[PDB]
Structure formats: C-alpha cells, structure tokens
Design a protein around this ligand. Structure first.
Ligand SMILES: N#Cc1c(-c2ccc(C(=O)O)cc2)c2c([nH]c1=O)-c1cccc(-c3cn[nH]c3)c1CC2
Ligand SMILES: [Mg+2]
Length: 186
C-alpha cells in the first residue's frame, strides 16, 4: 500500500508519519518512509529551495517552473518508490504529488478543479509515471506567508473533497494513529 501524508508547513506531518509508522508495525505490517522534497539529494529540489530564498534570478516568479522542479525531484525517485512498494507492506511518503497541486493552485488563486491541479496530474502521474497513492492523508490544523499558507490549506481540503488523484482522508492534530491505520489498511 502507498500512502502520502499532506498538509501545510508546520502542520506536523512528520509526527503523523512516525505515529502511523508505529501503528502499522504494531499491526504486524512492515513500513518504509520517504520525505519530499529530497533536499541534499536532488539537484532540482535544491535549486527550487534556493529559488524560494531569492537565488537563481526570476525563477521563483514562475509557479509552473517551481512546480516542474519539484516534479523532477519526485520523478527521480520513481524507481525507489516502486522498489519500496515491492519490499514493504506499507510505504508512507511525507509529501507527494498533491503538494504540487495545492501550492500551485493556491499561488495562482485557482481551485482544485483548475488548470494547475490538472497539469500536475498529467505531468507527474501520466507523463513522469509516478504511481498514484492508494490514500492521501491531509493533516489539517488551525495553524502551524500566512495568507498563502492558509489558502494552500484550503485548496488541500478541496483536493480531499474532490478525491484528487485517489481517495483521501482529512485528519486533525490529535487523530488516533491506531484507528487511522486500521482505516487505511486493506
Ligand atoms: N513537496 C513539495 C512542493 C512544495 C513544498 C516543498 C516543501 C515544503 C516544506 O518544506 O514545507 C512545502 C512545499 C512547493 C511546491 N511544489 C511542491 O511540489 C510549489 C509549487 C508551485 C509553486 C511554489 C511556490 C513558488 N513560490 N511560493 C511557492 C511551490 C513551493 C512549495
Ligand atoms: Mg489565476
């Protein structure tokens, strides 16, 4: 099974990934995890981060250019992902393709039915061949650029409501990981 944990910066995704990992292992399931972006490994990722800090000229001024970089990072891990899916009962990704759809649409003031979110699916899933996750879990919290972070949180909820890329669950800060694992497990 392939699961992506999503949410805005500060939501506490990593804590949820660890909680869930423990829950799955307590249920007798092997688990592997991977986090995106792969800063320090993927040059496309590193350039994107650097661009967010003002390097690389006008790069960060293009939503679609930034999206393309994070897509190339994930696409570089496509075989690692498929490997882990063969080797483990459950694979948990701390961010995945929906991160690109939510941040891109939020930046363009589009909704989850808009052009950027559709483009992300065509490029990452169809073109670059990334596997669709069995489940996408949105961690939605009251609080972790604030206006943008809040709008991204909302677009994320819209992706969950529409079933963008597959089935989702929306969870809060105090979700019971034992219960959540039983829900996610086939
Ligand atoms: N993974 C991922 C991922 C991320 C992302 C990475 C790390 C964190 C973190 O460390 O919390 C948070 C988010 C982003 C985008 N796309 C992705 O795929 C994306 C997509 C379009 C535009 C922009 C943008 C350009 N100016 N402002 C925003 C972005 C930036 C954020
Ligand atoms: Mg627009």
């Amino acid at each position: 099974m392939l699961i992506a944990i999503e949410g805005v910066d500060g939501a506490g995704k990593r804590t949820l990934v660890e909680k869930l990992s423990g829950a799955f292992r307590a249920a007798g399931r092997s688990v592997a995890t991977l986090a995106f972006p792969r800063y320090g490994q993927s040059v496309a990722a590193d350039i994107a981060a650097e661009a967010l800090h003002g390097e690389h000229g006008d790069l960060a001024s293009s939503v679609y250019a930034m999206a393309t970089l994070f897509a190339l990072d994930r696409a570089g891990a496509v075989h690692t992902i498929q490997g882990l899916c063969r080797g483990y009962d459950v694979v948990i990704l701390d961010r995945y393709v929906a991160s690109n759809a939510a941040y891109s649409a939020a930046r363009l003031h589009e909704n989850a039915a808009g052009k950027a979110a559709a483009w992300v699916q065509r490029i990452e899933f169809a073109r670059l061949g990334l596997p669709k996750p069995d489940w996408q879990v949105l961690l939605a919290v009251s609080a972790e650029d604030a206006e943008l972070q809040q709008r991204t949180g909302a677009v994320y909820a819209e992706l969950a409501a529409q079933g963008w890329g597959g089935r989702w669950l929306v969870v809060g800060a105090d979700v019971d990981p034992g219960r959540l694992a039983a829900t996610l497990a086939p």
